[PDB]
Design an enzyme around this catalytic site. Structure first.
Site, PDB file in Angstrom:
ATOM      1  CG  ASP A  96      25.119  25.555   9.891  1.00  0.00           C
ATOM      2  OD1 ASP A  96      24.221  26.371  10.220  1.00  0.00           O
ATOM      3  OD2 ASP A  96      26.114  25.627  10.372  1.00  0.00           O
ATOM      4  NE  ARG A 108      25.748  30.093  10.035  1.00  0.00           N
ATOM      5  CZ  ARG A 108      24.565  30.335  10.599  1.00  0.00           C
ATOM      6  NH1 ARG A 108      23.876  31.513  10.569  1.00  0.00           N
ATOM      7  NH2 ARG A 108      23.960  29.190  11.138  1.00  0.00           N
ATOM      8  CG  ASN A 109      27.174  27.329   6.012  1.00  0.00           C
ATOM      9  OD1 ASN A 109      28.480  27.233   5.964  1.00  0.00           O
ATOM     10  ND2 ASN A 109      26.455  26.751   7.099  1.00  0.00           N
ATOM     11  CG  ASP A 156      28.346  22.683   6.185  1.00  0.00           C
ATOM     12  OD1 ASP A 156      27.745  23.049   6.908  1.00  0.00           O
ATOM     13  OD2 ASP A 156      29.008  21.515   6.859  1.00  0.00           O
TER      14      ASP A 156
HETATM   15  C1  LIG Z   1      37.002  23.753  -0.247  1.00  0.00           C
HETATM   16  C2  LIG Z   1      35.690  23.044   0.375  1.00  0.00           C
HETATM   17  C3  LIG Z   1      35.647  21.860   0.824  1.00  0.00           C
HETATM   18  C4  LIG Z   1      34.613  21.142   1.315  1.00  0.00           C
HETATM   19  C5  LIG Z   1      33.386  21.828   1.114  1.00  0.00           C
HETATM   20  N1  LIG Z   1      32.307  21.145   1.284  1.00  0.00           N
HETATM   21  C6  LIG Z   1      30.892  21.373   1.278  1.00  0.00           C
HETATM   22  O1  LIG Z   1      30.686  22.583   0.650  1.00  0.00           O
HETATM   23  C7  LIG Z   1      29.752  20.544   1.696  1.00  0.00           C
HETATM   24  C8  LIG Z   1      28.501  20.854   1.593  1.00  0.00           C
HETATM   25  C9  LIG Z   1      27.469  20.119   1.743  1.00  0.00           C
HETATM   26  C10 LIG Z   1      27.844  18.765   2.573  1.00  0.00           C
HETATM   27  C11 LIG Z   1      26.766  17.625   2.842  1.00  0.00           C
HETATM   28  N2  LIG Z   1      27.019  17.661   4.470  1.00  0.00           N
HETATM   29  C12 LIG Z   1      25.743  16.473   4.805  1.00  0.00           C
HETATM   30  C13 LIG Z   1      25.784  16.308   6.248  1.00  0.00           C
HETATM   31  N3  LIG Z   1      25.654  17.571   6.856  1.00  0.00           N
HETATM   32  C14 LIG Z   1      25.506  17.318   8.262  1.00  0.00           C
HETATM   33  C15 LIG Z   1      26.791  18.508   6.651  1.00  0.00           C
HETATM   34  C16 LIG Z   1      26.708  18.801   4.931  1.00  0.00           C
HETATM   35  C17 LIG Z   1      29.375  18.482   2.513  1.00  0.00           C
HETATM   36  C18 LIG Z   1      30.302  19.267   2.364  1.00  0.00           C
HETATM   37  C19 LIG Z   1      33.298  23.086   0.710  1.00  0.00           C
HETATM   38  C20 LIG Z   1      34.308  23.711  -0.008  1.00  0.00           C
HETATM   39  N4  LIG Z   1      34.646  24.927  -0.301  1.00  0.00           N
HETATM   40  C21 LIG Z   1      34.620  26.205   0.104  1.00  0.00           C
HETATM   41  N5  LIG Z   1      34.222  26.102   1.380  1.00  0.00           N
HETATM   42  C22 LIG Z   1      34.053  27.322   2.075  1.00  0.00           C
HETATM   43  C23 LIG Z   1      34.403  28.373   1.519  1.00  0.00           C
HETATM   44  C24 LIG Z   1      34.588  28.493   0.119  1.00  0.00           C
HETATM   45  C25 LIG Z   1      34.783  29.738  -0.536  1.00  0.00           C
HETATM   46  C26 LIG Z   1      35.006  31.026   0.230  1.00  0.00           C
HETATM   47  C27 LIG Z   1      35.137  32.143  -0.562  1.00  0.00           C
HETATM   48  C28 LIG Z   1      35.362  32.078  -2.166  1.00  0.00           C
HETATM   49  N6  LIG Z   1      35.222  30.874  -2.447  1.00  0.00           N
HETATM   50  C29 LIG Z   1      35.036  29.698  -2.017  1.00  0.00           C
HETATM   51  N7  LIG Z   1      34.811  27.223  -0.324  1.00  0.00           N
END
Ligand SMILES: Cc1ccc(NC(=O)c2ccc(CN3CCN(C)CC3)cc2)cc1Nc1nccc(-c2cccnc2)n1
Ligand SMILES: [Cl-]
Ligand SMILES: [Cl-]
Ligand SMILES: [Cl-]
Length: 306
Positions: free
Chosen positions: A166, A170-171, A184
């Site tokens: 994704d 936005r991500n 994500d």
């Molecule tokens: C709090 C948190 C918990 C979990 C995650 N996760 C991820 O960021 C992430 C990225 C990549 C993967 C890898 N994955 C592999 C498989 N495919 C299908 C999906 C992705 C997994 C998790 C982010 C966050 N942080 C987050 N998330 C959304 C918004 C914000 C945010 C918003 C505004 C200001 N500061 C922070 N912060």
């Protein structure tokens, strides 16, 4: 299954991440979907000298079912597996004992990149912003840097055999110093009510960002992420416009993608960045550049502008 190559059921949750949930104080919601949300929080004693710090915390809502409980634990295992990286939102801790799963990351000062671009679009300056420096205008230099940083983060994910699926503005999160962080939102995005996700079969999918093999064959690979990165570039250099503007996702859209229709260059894209976009959208996945190759391409563009 949502993991093309890695197997999160065999990945260990490192207990070094474990944090006492009672040391979190929840604040405003940063994003919410049907089953999950991310909130701002203050964490006490996360720093060794007992200074407070603001973090972001992901958690499920009471609406969530067993599938989402498993998904959030899988996500935590994947983030723990990936480990520290400057271009990925930084995992800081998690709470797995004594309650539902909480996942704690850094807080990103400027929020998501899509809304940042839209906020800054009207005052964008291509070249040479001096006395105007205090206004923090968005410049072409910043856009190139964003493209470079996201490509470097994606080359890292690929080197870990991880498929984002994704990738889109936005991500991407933005923090101090025009530093991007791939994230994500996942379950913490209301995809039910987001017009960038489209009903396809029994799913709501980001079709305008998806490679043809992902749309029609549910294939997700290093090369399908590169296609999405191409669409992300179009968002970036259109200053936050929605892709294929004015085209609904319908039978006509799918036929046009299959037939080889592609977007023209956005108004602010350097020719050599549109060149990258065009190669990312090759119908043949093997003819797309790798993220490592994109990093080297953009690095040359940046050193040539200076
Ligand atoms: C709090 C948190 C918990 C979990 C995650 N996760 C991820 O960021 C992430 C990225 C990549 C993967 C890898 N994955 C592999 C498989 N495919 C299908 C999906 C992705 C997994 C998790 C982010 C966050 N942080 C987050 N998330 C959304 C918004 C914000 C945010 C918003 C505004 C200001 N500061 C922070 N912060
Ligand atoms: Cl949970
Ligand atoms: Cl993955
Ligand atoms: Cl051209």
């Amino acid at each position: 299954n949502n993991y093309s190559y890695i197997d999160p059921t065999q990945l260990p949750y490192d207990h070094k991440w474990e944090f006492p949930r009672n040391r979190l104080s929840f604040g405003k919601t940063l994003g919410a979907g049907a089953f999950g949300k991310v909130v701002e929080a203050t964490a006490q004693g996360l720093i060794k000298s007992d200074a407070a710090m603001t973090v972001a915390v992901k958690m499920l809502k009471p609406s969530a079912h067993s599938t989402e409980r498993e998904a959030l634990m899988s996500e935590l295992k994947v983030l723990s597996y990936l480990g520290n990286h400057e271009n990925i939102v930084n995992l800081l801790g998690a709470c797995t004992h004594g309650g539902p799963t909480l996942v704690i990351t850094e807080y990103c000062c400027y929020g998501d990149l899509l809304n940042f671009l839209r906020r800054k679009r009207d005052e964008f300056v291509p070249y040479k912003v001096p006395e105007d420096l205090y206004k923090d205008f968005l410049t072409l230099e910043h856009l190139l840097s964003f493209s470079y940083q996201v490509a470097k983060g994606m080359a890292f994910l690929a080197s870990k055999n991880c498929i984002h699926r994704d990738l889109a503005a936005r991500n991407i999160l933005l923090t101090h110093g025009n530093i991007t962080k791939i994230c994500d939102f996942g379950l913490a995005r209301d995809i039910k009510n987001d017009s960038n996700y489209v009903d396809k079969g029994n799913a709501r999918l980001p079709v305008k960002w998806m490679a043809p093999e992902s749309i029609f064959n549910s294939v997700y690979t290093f090369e399908s992420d590169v296609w999405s990165y191409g669409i992300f570039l179009w968002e970036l250099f259109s200053l936050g416009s929605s892709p294929y503007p004015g085209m609904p996702v319908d039978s006509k859209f799918y036929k046009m993608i299959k037939e080889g229709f592609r977007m023209s260059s956005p108004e602010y894209a350097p020719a050599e960045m549109y060149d990258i976009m065009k190669t990312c959208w090759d119908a043949d996945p093997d003819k797309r550049p790798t993220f490592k190759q994109i990093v080297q391409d953009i690095e040359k563009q940046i050193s040539e502008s200076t």
